[PDB]
Amino acid sequence: NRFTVAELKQLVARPDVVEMHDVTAQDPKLLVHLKATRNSVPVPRHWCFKRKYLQGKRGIEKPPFELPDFIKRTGIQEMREALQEKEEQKTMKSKMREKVRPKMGKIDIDYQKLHDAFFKWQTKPKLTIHGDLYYEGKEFETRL
Amino acid sequence: RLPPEVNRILYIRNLPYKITAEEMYDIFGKYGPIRQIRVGNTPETRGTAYVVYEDIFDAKNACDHLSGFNVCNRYLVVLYYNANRAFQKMDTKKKEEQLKL
Amino acid sequence: SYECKLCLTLHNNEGSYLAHTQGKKHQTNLARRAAKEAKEA
Amino acid sequence: ECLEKKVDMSKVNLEVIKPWITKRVTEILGFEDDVVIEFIFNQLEVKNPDSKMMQINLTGFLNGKNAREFMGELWPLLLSAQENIAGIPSAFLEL
Amino acid sequence: PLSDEELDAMFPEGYKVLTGFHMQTEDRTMKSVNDQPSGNLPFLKPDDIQYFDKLLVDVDESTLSPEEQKERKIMKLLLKIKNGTPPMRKAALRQITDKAREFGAGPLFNQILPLLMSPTLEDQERHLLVKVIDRILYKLDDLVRPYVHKILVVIEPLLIDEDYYARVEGREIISNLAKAAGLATMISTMRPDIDNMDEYVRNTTARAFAVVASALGIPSLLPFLKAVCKSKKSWQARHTGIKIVQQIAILMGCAILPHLRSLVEIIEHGLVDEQQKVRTISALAIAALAEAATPYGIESFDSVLKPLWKGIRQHRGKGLAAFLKAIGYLIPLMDAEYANYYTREVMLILIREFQSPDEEMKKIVLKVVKQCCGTDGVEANYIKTEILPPFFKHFWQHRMALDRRNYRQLVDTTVELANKVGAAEIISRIVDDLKDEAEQYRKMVMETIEKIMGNLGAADIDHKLEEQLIDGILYAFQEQTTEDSVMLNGFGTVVNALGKRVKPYLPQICGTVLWRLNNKSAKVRQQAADLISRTAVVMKTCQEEKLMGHLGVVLYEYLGEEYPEVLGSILGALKAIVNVIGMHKMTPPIKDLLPRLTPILKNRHEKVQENCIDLVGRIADRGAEYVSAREWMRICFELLELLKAHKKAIRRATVNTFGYIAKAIGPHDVLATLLNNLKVQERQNRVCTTVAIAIVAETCSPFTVLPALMNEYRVPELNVQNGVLKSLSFLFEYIGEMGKDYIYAVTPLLEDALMDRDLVHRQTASAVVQHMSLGVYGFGCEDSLNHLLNYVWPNVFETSPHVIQAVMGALEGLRVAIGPCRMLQYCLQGLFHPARKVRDVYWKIYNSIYIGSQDALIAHYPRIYNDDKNTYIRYELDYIL
Amino acid sequence: NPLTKVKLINELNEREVQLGVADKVSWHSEYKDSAWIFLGGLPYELTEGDIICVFSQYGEIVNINLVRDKKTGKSKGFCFLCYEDQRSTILAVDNFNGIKIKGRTIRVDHVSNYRAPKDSEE
Amino acid sequence: AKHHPDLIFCRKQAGVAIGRLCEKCDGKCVICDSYVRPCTLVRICDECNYGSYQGRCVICGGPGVSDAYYCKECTIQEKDRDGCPKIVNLGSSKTDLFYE
Amino acid sequence: GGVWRNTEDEILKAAVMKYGKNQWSRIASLLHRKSAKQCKARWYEWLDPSIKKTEWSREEEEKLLHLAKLMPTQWRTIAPIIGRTAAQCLEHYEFLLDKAAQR
Amino acid sequence: MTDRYTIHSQLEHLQSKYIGTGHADTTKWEWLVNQHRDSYCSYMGHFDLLNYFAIAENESKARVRFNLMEKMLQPCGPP
Amino acid sequence: CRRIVPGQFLAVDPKGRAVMISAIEKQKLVYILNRDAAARLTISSPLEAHKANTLVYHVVGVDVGFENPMFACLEMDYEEADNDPTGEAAANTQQTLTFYELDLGLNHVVRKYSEPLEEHGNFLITVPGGSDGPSGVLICSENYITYKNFGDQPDIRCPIPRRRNDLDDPERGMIFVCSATHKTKSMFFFLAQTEQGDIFKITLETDEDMVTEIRLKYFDT
Numbered sequence A: 001n002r003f004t005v006a007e008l009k010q011l012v013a014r015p016d017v018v019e020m021h022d023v024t025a026q027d028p029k030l031l032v033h034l035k036a037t038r039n040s041v042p043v044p045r046h047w048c049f050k051r052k053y054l055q056g057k058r059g060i061e062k063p064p065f066e067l068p069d070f071i072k073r074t075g076i077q078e079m080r081e082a083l084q085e086k087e088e089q090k091t092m093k094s095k096m097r098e099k100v101r102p103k104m105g106k107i108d109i110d111y112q113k114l115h116d117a118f119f120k121w122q123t124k125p126k127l128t129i130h131g132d133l134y135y136e137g138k139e140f141e142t143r144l
Numbered sequence B: 001r002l003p004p005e006v007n008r009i010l011y012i013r014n015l016p017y018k019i020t021a022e023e024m025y026d027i028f029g030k031y032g033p034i035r036q037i038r039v040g041n042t043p044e045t046r047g048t049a050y051v052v053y054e055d056i057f058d059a060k061n062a063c064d065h066l067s068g069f070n071v072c073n074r075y076l077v078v079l080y081y082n083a084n085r086a087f088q089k090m091d092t093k094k095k096e097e098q099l100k101l
Numbered sequence C: 001s002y003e004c005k006l007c008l009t010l011h012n013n014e015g016s017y018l019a020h021t022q023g024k025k026h027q028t029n030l031a032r033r034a035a036k037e038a039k040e041a
Numbered sequence D: 001e002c003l004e005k006k007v008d009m010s011k012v013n014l015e016v017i018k019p020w021i022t023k024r025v026t027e028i029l030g031f032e033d034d035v036v037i038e039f040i041f042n043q044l045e046v047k048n049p050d051s052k053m054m055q056i057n058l059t060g061f062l063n064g065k066n067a068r069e070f071m072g073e074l075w076p077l078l079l080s081a082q083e084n085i086a087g088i089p090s091a092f093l094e095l
Numbered sequence E: 001p002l003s004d005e006e007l008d009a010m011f012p013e014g015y016k017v018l019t020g021f022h023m024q025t026e027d028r029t030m031k032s033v034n035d036q037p038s039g040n041l042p043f044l045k046p047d048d049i050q051y052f053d054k055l056l057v058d059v060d061e062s063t064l065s066p067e068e069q070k071e072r073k074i075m076k077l078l079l080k081i082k083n084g085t086p087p088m089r090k091a092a093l094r095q096i097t098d099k100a101r102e103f104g105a106g107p108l109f110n111q112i113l114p115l116l117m118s119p120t121l122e123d124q125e126r127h128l129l130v131k132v133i134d135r136i137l138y139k140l141d142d143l144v145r146p147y148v149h150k151i152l153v154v155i156e157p158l159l160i161d162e163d164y165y166a167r168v169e170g171r172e173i174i175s176n177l178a179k180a181a182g183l184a185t186m187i188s189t190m191r192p193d194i195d196n197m198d199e200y201v202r203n204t205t206a207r208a209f210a211v212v213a214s215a216l217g218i219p220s221l222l223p224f225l226k227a228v229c230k231s232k233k234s235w236q237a238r239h240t241g242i243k244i245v246q247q248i249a250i251l252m253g254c255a256i257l258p259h260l261r262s263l264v265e266i267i268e269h270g271l272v273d274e275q276q277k278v279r280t281i282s283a284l285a286i287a288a289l290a291e292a293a294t295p296y297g298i299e300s301f302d303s304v305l306k307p308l309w310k311g312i313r314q315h316r317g318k319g320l321a322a323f324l325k326a327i328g329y330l331i332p333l334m335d336a337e338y339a340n341y342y343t344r345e346v347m348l349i350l351i352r353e354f355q356s357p358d359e360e361m362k363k364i365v366l367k368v369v370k371q372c373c374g375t376d377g378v379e380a381n382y383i384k385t386e387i388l389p390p391f392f393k394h395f396w397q398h399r400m401a402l403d404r405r406n407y408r409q410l411v412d413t414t415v416e417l418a419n420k421v422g423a424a425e426i427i428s429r430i431v432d433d434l435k436d437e438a439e440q441y442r443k444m445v446m447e448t449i450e451k452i453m454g455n456l457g458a459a460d461i462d463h464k465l466e467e468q469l470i471d472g473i474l475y476a477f478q479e480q481t482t483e484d485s486v487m488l489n490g491f492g493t494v495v496n497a498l499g500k501r502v503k504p505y506l507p508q509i510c511g512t513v514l515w516r517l518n519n520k521s522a523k524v525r526q527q528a529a530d531l532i533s534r535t536a537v538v539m540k541t542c543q544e545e546k547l548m549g550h551l552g553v554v555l556y557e558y559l560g561e562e563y564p565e566v567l568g569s570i571l572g573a574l575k576a577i578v579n580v581i582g583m584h585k586m587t588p589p590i591k592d593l594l595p596r597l598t599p600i601l602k603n604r605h606e607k608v609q610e611n612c613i614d615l616v617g618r619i620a621d622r623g624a625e626y627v628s629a630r631e632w633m634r635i636c637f638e639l640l641e642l643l644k645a646h647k648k649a650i651r652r653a654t655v656n657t658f659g660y661i662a663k664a665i666g667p668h669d670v671l672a673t674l675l676n677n678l679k680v681q682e683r684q685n686r687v688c689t690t691v692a693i694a695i696v697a698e699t700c701s702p703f704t705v706l707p708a709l710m711n712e713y714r715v716p717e718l719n720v721q722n723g724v725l726k727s728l729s730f731l732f733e734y735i736g737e738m739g740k741d742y743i744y745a746v747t748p749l750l751e752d753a754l755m756d757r758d759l760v761h762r763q764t765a766s767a768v769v770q771h772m773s774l775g776v777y778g779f780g781c782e783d784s785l786n787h788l789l790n791y792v793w794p795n796v797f798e799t800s801p802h803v804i805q806a807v808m809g810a811l812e813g814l815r816v817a818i819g820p821c822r823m824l825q826y827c828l829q830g831l832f833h834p835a836r837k838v839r840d841v842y843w844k845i846y847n848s849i850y851i852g853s854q855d856a857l858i859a860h861y862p863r864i865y866n867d868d869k870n871t872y873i874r875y876e877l878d879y880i881l
Numbered sequence F: 001n002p003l004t005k006v007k008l009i010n011e012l013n014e015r016e017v018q019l020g021v022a023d024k025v026s027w028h029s030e031y032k033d034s035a036w037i038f039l040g041g042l043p044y045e046l047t048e049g050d051i052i053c054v055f056s057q058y059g060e061i062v063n064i065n066l067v068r069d070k071k072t073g074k075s076k077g078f079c080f081l082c083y084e085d086q087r088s089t090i091l092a093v094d095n096f097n098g099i100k101i102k103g104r105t106i107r108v109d110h111v112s113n114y115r116a117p118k119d120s121e122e
Numbered sequence G: 001a002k003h004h005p006d007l008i009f010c011r012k013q014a015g016v017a018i019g020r021l022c023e024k025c026d027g028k029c030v031i032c033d034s035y036v037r038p039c040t041l042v043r044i045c046d047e048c049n050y051g052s053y054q055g056r057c058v059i060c061g062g063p064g065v066s067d068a069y070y071c072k073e074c075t076i077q078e079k080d081r082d083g084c085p086k087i088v089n090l091g092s093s094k095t096d097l098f099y100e
Numbered sequence H: 001g002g003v004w005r006n007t008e009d010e011i012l013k014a015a016v017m018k019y020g021k022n023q024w025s026r027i028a029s030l031l032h033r034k035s036a037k038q039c040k041a042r043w044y045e046w047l048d049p050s051i052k053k054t055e056w057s058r059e060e061e062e063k064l065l066h067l068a069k070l071m072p073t074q075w076r077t078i079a080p081i082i083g084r085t086a087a088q089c090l091e092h093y094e095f096l097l098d099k100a101a102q103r
Numbered sequence I: 001m002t003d004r005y006t007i008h009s010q011l012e013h014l015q016s017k018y019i020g021t022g023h024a025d026t027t028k029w030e031w032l033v034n035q036h037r038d039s040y041c042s043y044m045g046h047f048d049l050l051n052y053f054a055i056a057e058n059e060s061k062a063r064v065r066f067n068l069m070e071k072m073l074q075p076c077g078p079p
Numbered sequence J: 001c002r003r004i005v006p007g008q009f010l011a012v013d014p015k016g017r018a019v020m021i022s023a024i025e026k027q028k029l030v031y032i033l034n035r036d037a038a039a040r041l042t043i044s045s046p047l048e049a050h051k052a053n054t055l056v057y058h059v060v061g062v063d064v065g066f067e068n069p070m071f072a073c074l075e076m077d078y079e080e081a082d083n084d085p086t087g088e089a090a091a092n093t094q095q096t097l098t099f100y101e102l103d104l105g106l107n108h109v110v111r112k113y114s115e116p117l118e119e120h121g122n123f124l125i126t127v128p129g130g131s132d133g134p135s136g137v138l139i140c141s142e143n144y145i146t147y148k149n150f151g152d153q154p155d156i157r158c159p160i161p162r163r164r165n166d167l168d169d170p171e172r173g174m175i176f177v178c179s180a181t182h183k184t185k186s187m188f189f190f191l192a193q194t195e196q197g198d199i200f201k202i203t204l205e206t207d208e209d210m211v212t213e214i215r216l217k218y219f220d221t
C-alpha cells in the first residue's frame, strides 16, 4: 500500500529533500511537492525527538545577558550594580529603616542621554531571514 | 413517629469468625421474630452480616440498645442498610383478583 | 535553580539538591570512568 | 439502502395506513401504546420525511432488530401506494 | 410483607442464607481491628462505612484479583474527593478524568449514583459529586446509553433545588448528557416517567424534556410533544406535555418564536377538556408563550382568544386566574383597537376579583394591572376613580411585602401605574406609611418612592407634600435595623430629584447626621457617612459651601475609628467631598490630610484599603504639590504591602497610584521599589507590580524605565526575569503605536527569552511579540518580527495549555503584521506530516489563519500540478494579456 | 397548588420570627374586628362536632358554618368558624396550620369581611 | 474568557443590543481581557438580551453599570465581527465558592 | 500535623551541623512551618547520629523482654537503658515480638 | 436500511461553522476544491479580477460570472 | 471578499420594509426597515436564513402589496455532487428557485417555495405588482427567458431571438446582462440587454390576473 523511498526518490524531479518518514504519510506526492516548493521552511527536527527540545541543555552554563552598546553608554549598569552591592550588605534593620525613612537621589543621572541613546544613537541589531529556523544548538555552529 | 428511616434491615459489622450458625440466631431471636440472615463468602464479608426481620420495633430494640455491646472478643457495630439496587426486574407475573377480598 | 552535573538533573530549591545524595547512584557508576582513566585499581 | 427511493406523502392517503401500524406495534411490543402511533403520524405529516431518522427513533424504543423488519414492511407499502393514483397499498387493494 | 424472591433480588451477591458483679479484666488477644482504613486520606464518617466499607480491609492483590479492582479503585477516588483535602481532591479528580475511558461506565456509575441517593448528604458534597459527573461526561461520550434513567433519578431533584447555582449546574449537566447520548435515547428513557403517579418526578421529567429541547432544538422532538399532548387515555400525559411547552417557553426566550406557530397549533386542542388542571396549565402555557414572544405572533394566537373569553365569562376560580394571566400576557402583543376592547371589558372582572382571599390570584391580578394599563386605552380619571382605591384598600398590606415574588410585583406594578396616572397621586396616598412600626413595609414604600421619583421625576410634587416625604424618609433612616442600602440609594435619588428645592431642609438633615454619628457605636455610624457621601452632590448644586466646610473638618478626624466598616464609609464620604469640591479650596487641606491617610493605609480591611487608595490616587493626580516630596517615596513601599488583597479593584487602582506618584516625583526612585517587588515567591504581588512597571512606563514618557528593565534580566533569578518579560508584555500592550522605535532594542532580549530553557520565558516572550505585533501594525517593522517568529515557531510543539494559547495568540497577532504569506509559508510542508501530533496542530493553525484572513491567502497560495484525472491548476491566474 | 398555601402561610410566620417583628405589625392588626376563620382541605368524614372538638382548644367557636350541599351532597371541604376573641383566631392560624387529620392536610386562613356560600378556591 | 478555559461563548448573530458591564468588571475586554484602548461597542443577540437578562453584565451576569467595549487589539484582529461573545455557562468558578 | 519530609530533614541536619545543639529558634527560623519543640522532638527521635534505627539484635531483645515485665509502661525510662534510644522502636519491637509469640 | 450510522454532532469545542477550514485527516481533494471555490469567490468578489479576466476573451461580464459560477460545482473533477 | 460572509448579492423590498444581503454560500441576512416619529429610519436585528451546502447564484426581491415580503434566489445543492465520484450526480443537480417569506408578525425567515429549473439561469428580474400587475420574477437563462409565478401560473418559456446568419454560433448559448425595469404609470416594461448589445423590449400583457403569454422584440443596438 506504501511504495518505499526508492520510487519516491526516482519519480520526483527534486529528490534531494525526501526522507525515510515521508513514506508513511497519507499522500506523499503533494508532501514532497510542498517539501520542494519555493519559500517554505521545514518542520523542526524534534517532532520525533523525546527530549522536549530544550531539556537536553542541562549542564551548559551560559552568561546571563549581553547588553547592547547604546544601553551600556548610559551608565545605568554601573549604578545598578553599585546599588545592588550596597543592598546585599544591608540587614533587615536597615531594610526596614530605609523602607520608612528612604533616601533619594541615588541614580539621578539625566533625561537627555537616554533620549539620545534610544532615539539618536539607535543601533540596528543583526537580524536574519525567514529561513533561519532554530534547532537545538544553533550557537555552537558559529564555525560558518 | 418515624417515617424517614428504612426498616426490615440491620447491618452487622465486626462479627466473630467462630460463628457456625447459632449465635446470630440466638441474639436476633432473643429480641423477637426474624425473617432470615445473610452471611458473606468474601474474607471481608466473612465477619460482616445482613439480617432481615419481620417487625420494626424489634429492629429498633436491637439498634437502640445493642450499640456498644460486648460479645466474644471482637466488638460489633450495627447500622441501617440502604436498599438502592437490584440485578434483574421480575416479569410475567399474573397476580389476578382470584376472589380473595 | 540547582543542578547535579553528573546527574544532569534539576532541583527547584536547596533541599531538593541536598536530599539527592542517596538515590540513582551514578557516583558509583563513575567507577567505569575511573577504569577508563586507569586500567588498574 | 432500500430506504432511499424518494417519496411524496401528497400521493398517499393516511387514515387507511394507521390501524395496520397499530396492529403491527401491538404485535411487536405486546401491548398498546398511543405515543408511537402519533410518532408515525407526525413524522408522516411532512411531505418529505426521513427514513433514517425514523429508523433511529424506532431503534431507540425497540431492541434494534424489530425496527429493521418494521421499516422493511412499512416502506414498500408506501411505495406501492404512491405508485398508485389512489394511495392504497397492495395489501389493502386486494383485501 | 416481603417474599424471598424480592428479598434476594434486593440484596447483592457475595452472601449466603443459612448490685452486679465485679471480678477483673484480662489480657485480650489484641482487639485493635481496623475501624478506619489503613491510612490518613480523609477521615471516614459512620454513615460512609457502608458504601466505602470495602477499603477497610487491605487487598494485597493475589488469588482474589481479576481486572475488576482497576475498575473499583474509584471507590478510593470518591473517598479522597468527597471528604479529603482539596489538593488530594484535585489530584484524584485529574486521575479519574485521565482514566475515565479506562474505568468504563458500569462500575463507575453504579458506585457514583447510589451515593447521592443517601439522605445524609451535603451541598458541597453534592457539588463535588456532580463535578465528578460532568468531568467524566467529557470522556464517556456515546457510552452512557442504557444508564440514562439511573442517572436522571439521581440528578432530577437538583432542578427543583432552592439555590440557583445548583439549578444552573443541573441544567448544564443534563444538556451535556443530552448532547452526549443523542435524542432517541432520551425519548425512550424518560417516557415511562410520564404515566407515573408521583407528581414530583412528572414535573421534573417535564422540566428535563424542556432542557433537552433547549439543548437539541425544538423540531427534533416537537413530534414527541405533539404526540404526548393529543393522546386520550389519562390526563396526566397531556398535562405533562403542556407542562413541557410551558417550561420551554419560560426557559428559552425568543428562539421559540420561529417555532411558535407549530407549537401553538397544539394548544387549542386543550382548553375544552373535562379536567380543570389541563385547562389551567394550558392557559399557563399560552401565558408563557405570550411572555416569551413579546410582542410578535398576534395573528398566531387568534384561535386562542375565543375559549379564553368564554372561560372568563362562564368559569370562576383558579381557572379564571389562569385565563386572566393568559389574556393579560396576550394583550400587549395586540393592535390598539382589539387590545383596547379586551382591556375595557375585562376591568370589571379585575374589580370583582379584588376581594379574592388567595395570595396567588392577588399576584396574578397584580401582574395583570401592570401590563393592562400602559398603552393607550385607560385614561387618568378612570383609574383614579375606580381602579386604584380598591388597589390601595386591599393590596397594600403587610403579608404581600413578605413574599419576595409578591414584594417585587407590587412595586413593579406601581411603577407603571405612576407612569400612567402620575407621581403625587400615588405618593400622597402612600406618603403617610413611612412612619410605620414595620421595617419591610417601610422598605416597600421606600422602593416605591425611589422607583417613581427616579422614573418620573419630582415636578408633580408641590409644597404641600415634600415635608411629609422628607420627614418620613428621615424617620425611616433613624429606625432601620438591617444593613441594607436600598434606603441609602432611595435618599440619594430623592435628593438628586429635589436639587435646589431641598434648601430649607439641609440644616435639619445635617444636624440629624451630626448627632447620629455617635449612636452607641453599635454599628449605626456607616449609614450617616454614606448619607454624607450621597448628599455631597446636591449641596454644591444648591449653593451651599459653608456647611461643606463645617463637615469637612468633622470628617477630617472622625476617621480615628477602630471599626473598619465605619472607617470605610468615613473615607467614602471624604472621597465624595474631594470629588464634588475643588481640592485647593477645602478646609481640611491636603497638607495635613494625606499624612492622616497614611496610618489608615496600614489597615488590611478591603473597603478601607479601596477608599483609601482611591483618595490617594485622587490626591496623586490632583494634589501632588501639598507635600515635602518625601511622603510619596515612603508610601510606595507601603503600597507594596497594600497588594495581595482579593477584590481586583484595589489591585487595579494601586498601579494608577504608582503611575501618578512617578508622574509627581520622577520615575527613578519608585522604579527600584517596583523592581525590588519582583522577588516575592508569591503571586498577586509580582504581577501586580508588573502592571505597576507598565503604568510607570505609560503614564510619564518612555526611555526612563527601559534600561533598568533590560538590566534586571542579568540578575540570575527566575521571578525577576519573568517579571521583566511580563512587564514588556503589558508595556507594548499599553503603548501600541509607540513601540515602533523600541522593537530593535528589545529584540536581543526576546531572542534570549525564546532561547531560554524554561517555557515560562517563552510564553511571556510570545505575549510580548503578540502585543508588539498588535502595536507596530502598519509601520514597516516586519524584519524583527520575522526574526522573532523564527524562534516562536519551534515552540508550537509544546503541549501545556498556557504556552500553547500564548503562542497561538502570538501567531494570530503576527498573522496581520508581516502578512499572511509568511504564516502560510511557515504552515507549508507541515500539513500532511505523518506524525499526528504535529499534523492536527498545524491544521488548526491553518484553520485560524483561514478564518482570520481568507482572501489575503488567495494571492498567497502555491501551485499544485495536475494528477491523471482532476484539474488542480488555477488556469485563470496563469495566462496574461 | 391545593396545599402550597400551607407552606406560604408557614413561610410568613418564619419570616416574622426571622426578622423579629413585634406583635403590633405582625399581620394581625390588619385583620382586626373579625373572629371569622376559613378552613381548607377538610375530609368528608368530618361532622360539625368533631370540628368543634378539634378547634375548641383555643376557645369555643361561637358560629359554625359547614358547606353542606343542597340536595345530592353532604360536604365540600370548606368551613367557617367564628370564635369569641380575635387572639384566638391569631393562635388558631399560627398553631393549627400544617397539621393533618386522616390523610389530607388542612389550612387555616382569615375571612375578615362576611360569610359566603362559595367564593373560595377548592 | 482566557483565564478560565471551560467557559464557552454564545457565538450567535449580533444585533443592535449594546452589551453592558458590571461595576466589578468595568473596563474589562471580553476576549483578551484588557483595560486599555477601547474601539468597538459590543453587540449581542436578542436571546441573551431579553426579559430579566437586560441591563446585565456579559461575564459575571450581574447588574450592568457601564457599556461594554472591544479593544483595538481585538479590532484589528477582527475578533469583534464574529458571533456574540456572551458567556453562557458558569463552571468551577463562583459556584464552589458559594458552597464554601 | 508534622509530616516531616526528607527535604526538611536534611536541611535540619545541615542546621544542626552548622549552628549547634541547644540552638533551636535560630534553626527553626528557616523552615516556614515548624517551631523549636517539634524540631527538638524529631532530632532527639530520628536525626541524632547515635540512633540505631535499624539492625535489631538478640541481646537487646532478651534484655527488654524481662525489662518490659519489670515495668509494663515507661518505655522512655528504659530507652537509655537499652541503647536503642529512639523510644518508639522499642514499642515496635515489643508489639512485633508479641505478635510473633501469638500468631 | 442502515447499520451503526447514527453519529450526530458532538461536543462544541470550537464550533467550526466556517466551511473550507479542514481537519487533521483532511484529504487532498477537499482542501483543493475549497481552494478553487475561494479563488472563484475572490474572482467574482473583486470587480478588478473580473475586468482582467474579461479583457482576454471578448465575453461580457455576466458571461464570465455565470461560467465561473457554474464551475464552482466540480472545478477539479470527481473524487 | 470571502465565500462565507454576505455582501456579494443584495435584494430589497420595493415598498421599503426589508432588505436581504447574501453571500454565495450558507447565510443570507435580513434587516427589517421601519420609521419612527422623528421621520427616522430604524433597523432591527439581522434575521437568519442559514442553509448549509447550498450555493446562491442571484437574489432578487418580489414586489408584494402590503404582504409579507418575499425574496427569490437561485440555489443549488452540491453535497451529492461531491460525495458521489461517479460524475453523473454532478450533472443532474439542477437549479432551484427558492422563495423566502419574511413574517413580520412572527419575526423569522422560512423556506416557503422551492421549485426546480430544467435550465440554468444567471440572474432575475423583479416584476411590479400589487395593484400594478402580475407580481413575479423573470428568469434569464441561456437562449431562454422564463416566467414561473407560483400557485397556478405555469412556466412560460420564450426562446431568445438570434440574428439572421451571424457568424458566432458553432454551439454557443445566449444570455442577458441587464434588466432595466421601467414603470411609465400606465404599463410597465423591461429594456433587457444581451451580451452583444441587442436591447429587448419585454412587455407583459395579461387579460386575467393569471399570465397568458410573454413576448419581446428587438429594440435597439
Ligand SMILES: [Zn+2]
Residues within 6 Å of the ligand: G021, G022, G024, G025, G026, G057, G058, G059, G060, G061, G062
Ligand atoms: Zn462582570
Ligand SMILES: [Zn+2]
Residues within 6 Å of the ligand: G029, G030, G031, G032, G033, G034, G070, G071, G072, G073, G074
Ligand atoms: Zn481585547
Ligand SMILES: [Zn+2]
Residues within 6 Å of the ligand: G010, G011, G012, G044, G045, G046, G047, G048, G049, G084, G085, G086
Ligand atoms: Zn448572545
